[PDB]
């Protein structure tokens, strides 16, 4: 009803939407907080650090801090274990091989917005971004 | 002169060099004032700084209430004795040397001034005007 479209912009690790971006936030439009603290008190508590996107919605007298996104994120998703580190473990450089099909099984999902010859382009693409897969596929 | 002295002052004969003692002519408890400095006076090897009518000096109280003795304070010369000369042509003089203890701004410590007061001082220091009887 009294609604519109997204904004696609985070900023941060700090939850509660950026931090207090759970509160200015009606200020030309017409919303207030429909996770914009409770599914954002599930934003970074969900995917702590690094950022990803936030796509605040404006759907019905209430925003929506939408913490959708894609790769980078889904890239290091190339793994199977990462027992945290607390803080300051000397960078904890997680880089070491992966599975085969780096591509139509890990970029056919990130295709579309990439341009030109699919694989040759995109499928190739994702590869380089593996700076954290540090050791390349094998 | 200096602070709180609204007005300029035409030169008048210097009557009182450092070391001179004038009568204290207020009701502050001070009996006399011993001049140790003149404000705004200049420098020449061997010259004593010396005050005149309506000059602000720096004095100590040689005779007077002990709460006033043993310290240096500002005073203002109100009567002279060394004769001086005004721009109406007159050479005039008082019977005594005398001034009144005062603050850097120029406020009297006391509330009366006993005896006369020369106009050139009255004209210079308003709170002195206030407390003056016969002027000149």
């Amino acid at each position: 009803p009294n609604e519109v479209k997204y904004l696609y912009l985070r900023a941060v690790g700090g939850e509660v939407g950026a931090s207090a971006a759970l509160a200015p936030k009606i200020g030309p439009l017409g919303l207030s907080p429909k996770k914009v603290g409770e599914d954002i008190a599930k934003a970074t508590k969900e995917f702590k650090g690094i950022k990803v996107t936030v796509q605040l919605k404006i759907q019905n007298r209430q925003a929506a801090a939408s913490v959708v996104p894609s790769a980078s994120s889904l890239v290091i998703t190339a793994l199977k274990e990462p027992p945290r580190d607390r803080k300051k473990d000397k960078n904890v450089k997680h880089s070491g091989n992966i599975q085969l099909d780096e591509i139509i099984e890990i970029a056919r999902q990130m295709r579309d917005k990439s341009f030109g010859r699919t694989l040759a382009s995109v499928t190739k693409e994702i590869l380089g971004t593996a700076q954290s897969v540090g050791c390349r596929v094998d | 002169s200096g602070n709180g002295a609204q007005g300029t002052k035409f030169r008048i004969s210097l009557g009182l060099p450092v070391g001179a003692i004038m009568n204290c002519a207020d009701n502050s408890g001070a009996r006399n004032l011993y001049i140790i400095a003149v404000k705004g006076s200049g420098s020449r090897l061997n010259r004593l700084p010396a005050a005149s009518l309506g000059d602000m000096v720096m004095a100590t109280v040689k005779k007077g209430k002990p709460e006033l003795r043993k310290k240096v304070m500002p005073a203002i010369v109100v009567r002279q004795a060394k004769s001086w000369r005004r721009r109406d042509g007159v050479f005039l003089y008082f019977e005594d040397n005398a001034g009144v203890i005062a603050n850097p701004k120029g406020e009297m410590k006391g509330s009366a001034i006993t005896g006369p007061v020369g106009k050139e001082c009255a004209d210079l220091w308003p709170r002195v005007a206030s407390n003056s009887g016969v002027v000149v």
């Binding site: 700090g14 509660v16 207090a20 759970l22 509160a23 | -």
Partner: protein, 386 residues
Amino acid sequence: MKVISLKKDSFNKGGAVITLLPEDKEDLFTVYQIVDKDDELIFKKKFTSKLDEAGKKKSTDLVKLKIKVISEDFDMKDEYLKYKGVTVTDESGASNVDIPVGKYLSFTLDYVYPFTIIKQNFNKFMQKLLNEACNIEYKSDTAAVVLQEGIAHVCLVTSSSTILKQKIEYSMPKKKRTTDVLKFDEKTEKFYKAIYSAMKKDLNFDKLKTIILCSPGFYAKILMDKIFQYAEEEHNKKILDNKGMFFIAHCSTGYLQGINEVLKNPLYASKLQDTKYSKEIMVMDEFLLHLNKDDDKAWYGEKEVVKAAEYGAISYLLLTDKVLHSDNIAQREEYLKLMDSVESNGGKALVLSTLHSLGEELDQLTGIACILKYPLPDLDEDDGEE
């Protein structure tokens, strides 16, 4: 505090037997956090103050009571720590002899006589507070150096108190017949090395702020320049960054006297850099610099600093004497976590005395405040207020 003993029995791996002498009300508060209910203390008083009844009659003595602890009456402002208890009743006669068993008895502590704590629950947190100091509140920040021409005292203030930590001292130059017989310069050179080593070790030389360098004569100034000479030699940037921990003072007397000559006399001190208002003043500046240009990079008050911390924007923490020593105990735990918590997110720390203009400004602000490294807007929301 002065700890006479402290031993670890063979029959008890855990607890301890501590004989100790509290020296000031900061050391009363230390005792407090060590002593548990059901621990034992043997102290002295002065009981024998009987009936009449058969005989006169009393006797006198100086009778020492082994009391088991049951309760405490603790008043920090009043400099009053008191332990209530029952006699342990040393039926063995070795202790408690001359006291009449079956009768409660109290200990108002004094700074005069030491006492023994037979402890059950001697933990690592108490041990810190017994051998590093125990001001989790921090009042001080000072060290001094008096030198005459022949005697020196390196003095020093505490980790907790106006309580000396280390009375150093060298061979000081004494104005000899010749040009000041070269032994002067080498021996003075030694002292700097001796004082730098002691302060490095004793402290975490990031806890003290002040060295006052005090002399009758040019000695102090000579020594300052000598400090920073040797500083450039070693490329000792712990010293070279920091023209603000040494402050150069003259005095007549220079034994332990000299310090109180320097301080309390308006020659060399006032509210300029003595360095126990140092960074205390500098950060409380910057705190209002930010807060009055409504920038969101300074925040204030027990409610508001804890929230400015939840957002994890804060660097220089502003804490007080008043809100601590005004009356309240417990409360200062909360703020101590809150300093670490905040630093675990960013920052140093400044405790200001409220006995002064600056501490009073911050006290009108609940005695707790911050400067942030970065703006974090609307820290007063989530938590509800202004």
